[PDB]
Design a protein around this ligand. Structure first.
Ligand code: ATP
Ligand code: ATP
Ligand code: ADP
Lengths: 529, 107
């Protein structure tokens, strides 16, 4: 019955029992029976997971328990050189101790463990993707010849770590080679609690931590945090608490009693959590203010309809089986203000993982980079129980121009394939699109892929414009009366963004001529669909 | 004995449920070797990668005494689109050449 729970490991308790049952069953029984059977031991294992879920600690602990020598750590990208036949020397140099021990002590030497990292770096499968990364495939072959070949080694154990499990050569997973896979996923509430408890043992012993702080509250508040983020939060809290205490001491010559006391209190934790740490797999509240610049104002019925339909779709996707994938599209004329409503409906879901992929961060990229970024975003989203991805502008991504027409086919195919690929079992997803030209989009045969459509109309009645102006509150009483008198023709067809821009333009002169200028500008844009 | 190679094509309107039927009929055979070549596992690949994958899968299938290969959503592999039209000629040529090649004797 192990005891590692409290020393270094923390959250991950079941993976140990699983790996011990699967791999190290041979080395825990008396040697007599095993030598009678004549069976061999597994010659390595593989690990994959998110970047920073606690992989190295597993390898170090496993090496420690087996009563082995010092592990020979090494990095993936480091073993690579532009000279002909120089990587092979680096690969060969690793085993020298193992060969020496095998030669000298015979069949009674200890155990040596070699820990690669980012093993996916050295592989010829990456060349399959768009690019030139053949990495002189020969390299990988050399590695095989050390695990197996004419010469036999029986005092070695290879542990591999990877981040892209789909870029591993198939030949490196056959029997007699790395032949045991395992996954290390995100922690849960109990895991977060245990990790925070273990990382906070030091201060409790010295009474430095304040009694005000609890641990359950912080555990529940952190939804989708990873391993490194917890210790980063602890360090940031320590730093900010020290800074606050020293600044307060400088400002006020408090008595010594409080000067010696360095209680971190609870305010520092909340401030640091809300201000410093930005999880990579969690909601980013900052980006929201960059899109919803002026909030939302209810100028008509359709907004309520759209919000209600979005809530219905969210509820349907949340709790339901037999349908783990859902799609929806938004349509409307230009400047109708679509992105804001999509962002609002996405925000209201209270999901743990929300992401927005827009051409905003994608200027000058080649199509191949676009497909790579899309695939990366969707792969990252796949690694959460619930997720919500927003695609900003479908038309701009495809590089569409009416002349020609011209566009990039690779991106279109990638998007179409992605929209019809369910996540792994037991996980949900939601996708929301947005566009300003449905006719071409239907002509491209993609409208069949989406599952539902919604319409966002513009302003079309005078009283609606009056209500919008009243809510904005920029015209006086007599000004409003004159505007209502002049706009009773009812021939109004404008977008919200254009209305805001025009109001800003009109408010740039003396108060006397504002109304006439605004009315002239409004009439000048006399559209008639 | 005189017809070592056979072909059959399923077609119909969208959302009719073709892939499931293809999978069921492939499964019911009880052959020792079965394989599926779906497009969703080649996301972002280039035409050369797709042709290499097809060649590798068919070469692997060649080594048995009985086999069954399923290819799903043929129109999607070619990268078809009504506007244009557009497609990758190389993939189409490769598939045409495959679809009338017999295996070595006695397979
Ligand atoms: N109820 C509302 N509906 C629409 N826009 C609103 C609303 N309330 C405020 N706004 C403001 O309208 C603007 C909406 O801009 P948005 O990016 O959505 O425009 P758009 O027409 O979808 O753009 P594009 O098609 O060019 O991407 C923002 O300033 C937002 O603050
Ligand atoms: N008798 C049946 N015939 C067809 N589909 C069935 C039948 N019974 C159940 N199904 C369900 O129908 C769905 C078939 O999905 P499938 O991917 O084959 O559809 P499709 O229209 O051929 O797809 P694609 O979009 O690739 O053309 C599966 O959910 C399957 O469970
Ligand atoms: N289960 C865990 N319990 C406690 N600490 C963890 C755990 N997982 C990760 N960590 C923290 O993460 C750090 C090591 O990160 P590591 O897993 O080596 O990242 P990478 O996998 O990118 O090398 C350590 O400082 C450790 O405190």
């Amino acid at each position: 019955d192990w005891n590692f729970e409290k020393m270094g490991i923390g959250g991950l308790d079941k993976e140990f029992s699983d790996i011990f049952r699967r791999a190290f069953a041979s080395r825990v029984f008396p040697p007599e029976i095993v030598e009678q059977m004549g069976c061999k031991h597994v010659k390595g294992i593989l690990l994959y997971g998110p970047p920073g879920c606690g992989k190295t600690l597993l390898a170090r602990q496993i090496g420690k328990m087996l009563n082995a020598r010092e592990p020979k750590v090494v990095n993936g990208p480091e073993i690579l050189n532009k000279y002909v036949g120089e990587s092979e020397a680096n690969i060969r140099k690793l085993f020298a101790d193992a060969e020496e021990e095998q030669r000298r002590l015979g069949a009674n030497s200890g155990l040596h463990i070699i820990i690669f990292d980012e093993i996916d770096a050295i592989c010829k499968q990456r060349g399959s993707m768009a690019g030139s990364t053949g990495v002189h495939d020969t390299v990988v072959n050399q590695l095989l010849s050390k695990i197996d070949g004419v010469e036999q080694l029986n005092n070695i154990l290879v542990i591999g770590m990877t981040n892209r499990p789909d870029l591993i050569d198939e030949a490196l997973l056959r029997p007699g080679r790395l032949e045991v896979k395992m996954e290390i996923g995100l922690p849960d509430e109990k895991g977060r609690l245990q990790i925070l408890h273990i990382h906070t043992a030091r201060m409790r012993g010295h009474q430095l931590l304040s009694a005000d702080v609890d641990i359950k509250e912080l555990a529940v508040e952190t939804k989708n945090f990873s391993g490194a983020e917890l210790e980063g939060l602890v360090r940031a809290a320590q730093s900010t608490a020290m800074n606050r205490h020293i600044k307060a001491s400088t400002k006020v010559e408090v008595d010594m009693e409080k000067a010696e006391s360095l209680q971190v209190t609870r305010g520092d934790f909340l401030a640091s959590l809300e201000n410093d740490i930005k999880p990579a797999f969690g909601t980013n509240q900052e980006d929201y203010a960059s899109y919803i610049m002026n909030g939302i104002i209810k100028w008509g019925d359709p907004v309520t309809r759209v919000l209600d339909d979005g809530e219905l779709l969210v509820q349907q996707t949340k709790n339901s089986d037999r349908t783990p994938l859902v799609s929806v599209l938004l349509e409307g004329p230009p400047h109708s203000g679509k992105t804001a409503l999509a962002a609002k409906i996405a925000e209201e879901s209270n999901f743990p993982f929300i992401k927005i992929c827009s051409p905003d961060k994608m200027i000058g990229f080649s199509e191949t980079a676009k497909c790579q970024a899309m695939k990366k975003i969707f792969d990252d989203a796949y690694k959460s129980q619930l997720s919500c991805v927003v695609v900003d502008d479908i038309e701009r991504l495809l590089d569409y121009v009416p002349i020609g027409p011209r566009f990039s086919n690779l991106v279109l195919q990638a998007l179409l394939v992605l929209l019809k690929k369910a996540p792994p079992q037991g996980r949900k997803l939601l996708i929301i699109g947005t566009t300003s030209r449905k006719d071409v989009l239907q002509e491209m045969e993609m409208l069949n892929a989406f599952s539902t459509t919604i319409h966002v109309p513009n302003i079309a009645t005078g009283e609606q414009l009056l209500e919008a102006l009243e809510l904005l509150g920029n015209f006086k009483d007599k000004e409003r009366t004159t505007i209502a008198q002049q706009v009773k023709g009812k021939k109004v067809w404008i977008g919200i963004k254009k209305l805001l821009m025009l109001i800003e333009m009109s408010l740039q002169m003396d108060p006397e001529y504002r109304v006439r200028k605004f009315l002239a500008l409004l009439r000048e844009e006399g559209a008639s669909p």
